[PDB]
Design an enzyme around this catalytic site. Structure first.
Site, PDB file in Angstrom:
ATOM      1  N   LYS A 189      19.921  13.202  23.928  1.00 51.27           N
ATOM      2  CA  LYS A 189      19.352  12.301  22.933  1.00 51.27           C
ATOM      3  C   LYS A 189      19.736  10.829  23.043  1.00 51.27           C
ATOM      4  O   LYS A 189      20.748  10.486  23.654  1.00 51.27           O
ATOM      5  CB  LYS A 189      19.663  12.863  21.543  1.00 51.27           C
ATOM      6  CG  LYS A 189      19.201  14.310  21.430  1.00 51.27           C
ATOM      7  CD  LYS A 189      19.425  14.931  20.063  1.00 51.27           C
ATOM      8  CE  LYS A 189      18.829  16.336  20.029  1.00 51.27           C
ATOM      9  NZ  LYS A 189      19.225  17.139  18.845  1.00 51.27           N
ATOM     10  N   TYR A 214       9.813  20.117  18.140  1.00 45.32           N
ATOM     11  CA  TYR A 214      10.421  20.346  16.831  1.00 45.32           C
ATOM     12  C   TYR A 214       9.412  20.848  15.795  1.00 45.32           C
ATOM     13  O   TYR A 214       9.651  20.750  14.590  1.00 45.32           O
ATOM     14  CB  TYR A 214      11.080  19.056  16.335  1.00 45.32           C
ATOM     15  CG  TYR A 214      12.332  18.668  17.101  1.00 45.32           C
ATOM     16  CD1 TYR A 214      13.526  19.374  16.930  1.00 45.32           C
ATOM     17  CD2 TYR A 214      12.325  17.597  17.996  1.00 45.32           C
ATOM     18  CE1 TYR A 214      14.677  19.023  17.627  1.00 45.32           C
ATOM     19  CE2 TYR A 214      13.472  17.239  18.702  1.00 45.32           C
ATOM     20  CZ  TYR A 214      14.642  17.955  18.512  1.00 45.32           C
ATOM     21  OH  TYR A 214      15.776  17.609  19.207  1.00 45.32           O
ATOM     22  N   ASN A 234      23.140  14.176  17.114  1.00 45.20           N
ATOM     23  CA  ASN A 234      24.083  15.147  17.633  1.00 45.20           C
ATOM     24  C   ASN A 234      24.168  15.176  19.153  1.00 45.20           C
ATOM     25  O   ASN A 234      24.527  16.190  19.750  1.00 45.20           O
ATOM     26  CB  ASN A 234      23.751  16.536  17.089  1.00 45.20           C
ATOM     27  CG  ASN A 234      22.282  16.873  17.205  1.00 45.20           C
ATOM     28  OD1 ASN A 234      21.635  16.560  18.207  1.00 45.20           O
ATOM     29  ND2 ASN A 234      21.748  17.532  16.184  1.00 45.20           N
ATOM     30  N   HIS A 237      20.698  18.724  22.721  1.00 46.91           N
ATOM     31  CA  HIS A 237      19.977  19.918  22.314  1.00 46.91           C
ATOM     32  C   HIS A 237      19.968  20.870  23.492  1.00 46.91           C
ATOM     33  O   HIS A 237      19.767  20.456  24.634  1.00 46.91           O
ATOM     34  CB  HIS A 237      18.520  19.646  21.968  1.00 46.91           C
ATOM     35  CG  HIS A 237      17.660  20.869  22.069  1.00 46.91           C
ATOM     36  ND1 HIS A 237      17.629  21.840  21.091  1.00 46.91           N
ATOM     37  CD2 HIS A 237      16.885  21.331  23.081  1.00 46.91           C
ATOM     38  CE1 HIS A 237      16.873  22.847  21.496  1.00 46.91           C
ATOM     39  NE2 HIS A 237      16.411  22.565  22.701  1.00 46.91           N
ATOM     40  N   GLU A 254      10.273  25.688  25.387  1.00 49.11           N
ATOM     41  CA  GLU A 254      10.813  24.343  25.546  1.00 49.11           C
ATOM     42  C   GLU A 254      10.650  23.806  26.956  1.00 49.11           C
ATOM     43  O   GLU A 254      10.342  22.629  27.152  1.00 49.11           O
ATOM     44  CB  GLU A 254      12.282  24.328  25.145  1.00 49.11           C
ATOM     45  CG  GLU A 254      12.490  24.031  23.677  1.00 49.11           C
ATOM     46  CD  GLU A 254      13.890  24.335  23.222  1.00 49.11           C
ATOM     47  OE1 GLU A 254      14.826  24.166  24.037  1.00 49.11           O
ATOM     48  OE2 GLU A 254      14.056  24.734  22.050  1.00 49.11           O
TER      49      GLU A 254
END
Lengths: 130, 130, 129, 130, 129, 129
Positions: free
Chosen positions: B10, B51, B110, B113, B124
């Site tokens: 991220k 998402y 965070n 992922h 994914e």
């Protein structure tokens, strides 16, 4: 939700040259230093007010002697869930991955102290940073 | 028993300069990079398909805004029990020793992922690596 | 506390170090070289005053940076501490050094270390009277 | 309360250049090296006495072949609660923060062995350090 | 994304880096020097073609190594990026540098960084048209 | 075990390294440079004898240090191992090197590495006959 917690880097961290290594782990977790004081030799009375809840226990005097046998650093860190999060980084000597888990091997010379609750934090912070 | 899982690094990892540090932990665990794509700014539609199961939740748009506010890297790692093993490295912010445990302090930013299941991984992986 | 030595030097850990979370990284290199801390002081924002006396020689532009974020002044002790730490600081072109490995700007360079016995004495006086 | 435990650094640690990295984690936990022997190729009979309790299991021969396919190092560490503490550092591949957790991904090539009990330690220590 | 600068350079993370699991270690040193990634491309096995154009100057022996395992081409941006990263790459004899600390072979040396503005432009063109 | 090379050198990891818990740190730098271990021997307290032959050239003062705490003698193998490792050892003034980053004393300097082919041969003979 920001919080402020008090952290103490004990004399053994200095003897073992682990000061930077300990602060780094907290820093990398993204907590910021709000206040900081370096004690070549923290005043005993200040140590006794901090560990006063153990005043009636066996190792109280020794832990006190130890906390006054080398320099100490008191830091006030700030961050989201700082109190709980940092208390976890500190961990215990039986849990690798944490500070005490990867670097300590004694329940007395445990390199670091982190506030364990909000009340404990406000009280501890008023002690070292009146 | 080899497996392939999808991993996303991220925007916050880039802002905080933790890209190498995160990939290193996965690398040191002996997982190999099968596929890799660097996104200066991942396409929003690609983020929303990924998402989509959170499409009806409060922070959906924000998490989406965040995932598009900085560069991103999508990697397909390969190794034994890769899916479960890497999901563990990722961990959570309350578990030191893991990636989020030692480097993160927000449930949104965070840093990383990792696919949480085989189905999630195949889906994914088809998303970022059609 | 073995570290101890025959020389005393002043170090300033600049605001950028805090913003880039390199405070420990920086302090670690000095600590591993086995230098001990004599005095240490943290400033949420060092006084405009002190910044001026320190660099008392675009002056105002740099002064602004040194006053923006927080700083940590440290007094290190060890044999030939002044020179040794100066070499640890190094510069932007020298890999293996703090600035060499971690910085890429002549103003925002993460750390300052006294360059000479004279400097060290005055610098320690400004931050630790 | 000092203890002595036996530790083996397996051939894979050498192939992957993780010898120093593994010993470092133990060292940083403050355990000291009492005895040390380097085996370019440990004698098979010595390996079989050590893994004799697995003598009737399927992978016994393979684990044995593996333990003899590269150099090995046998170390006797000393410290407080050394046996239990180091066994924890070793951990397992499903627990990040530990040695196997951060660096291993196979139940056979698991980089390191640490005594799991006092009896196991005394026996293991008499094997490599008669 | 502060990193940004006034120069653009090309970096190649070689197959040996992947085999020795030093990809992150290598990328980390550049990232800590605060250089940002502009373009990046992973090749399970870069095209024979590109390897030839790049080193277009035992040629075939090295070309084979650069084509054996996977590689990662990266375009770094920062002030004086070309020179600075070149110094980070260093050589086999210079400790503190990537090759100095991690390599011991003139062919299998883990990383490549453009040596000049001209090189950088052509190299970026070959891997990032 | 790729590491292997065309030269053999002797390394001594001194007592101070053990006291400061830098044994791994030290061995790690050599291992990352990809040198392999041929022979290795741990001494809770190397024989007074060997220390004398090794430095056979305040002699007694240093000999005392090398005999105080434990030591580890290692034989490294690799191409140009002697020179390369010597450079890794470096000195107290050179950052990026073992002594440069971790030591601050001319006697208590953490590590010893053969300085020449001749030295290496004799040194390997003293510790590994």
């Amino acid at each position: 939700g920001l919080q402020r917690t008090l952290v103490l880097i004990k004399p053994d961290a200095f003897e073992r040259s682990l000061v930077a290594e300990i602060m780094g782990r907290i820093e990398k977790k993204n907590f910021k230093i709000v206040s900081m004081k370096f004690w070549s030799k923290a005043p005993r009375n200040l140590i006794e007010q901090h560990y006063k809840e153990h005043s009636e226990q066996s190792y109280f005097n020794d832990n006190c002697d130890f906390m006054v046998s080398g320099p100490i650093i008191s830091i006030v860190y700030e961050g989201t869930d700082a109190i709980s999060k940092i208390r976890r980084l500190q961990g215990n000597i039986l849990t690798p991955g944490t500070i005490r888990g990867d670097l300590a091997n004694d329940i007395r010379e445990n390199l670091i102290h982190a506030s364990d609750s909000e009340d404990s934090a406000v009280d501890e912070i008023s002690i070292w940073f009146p």
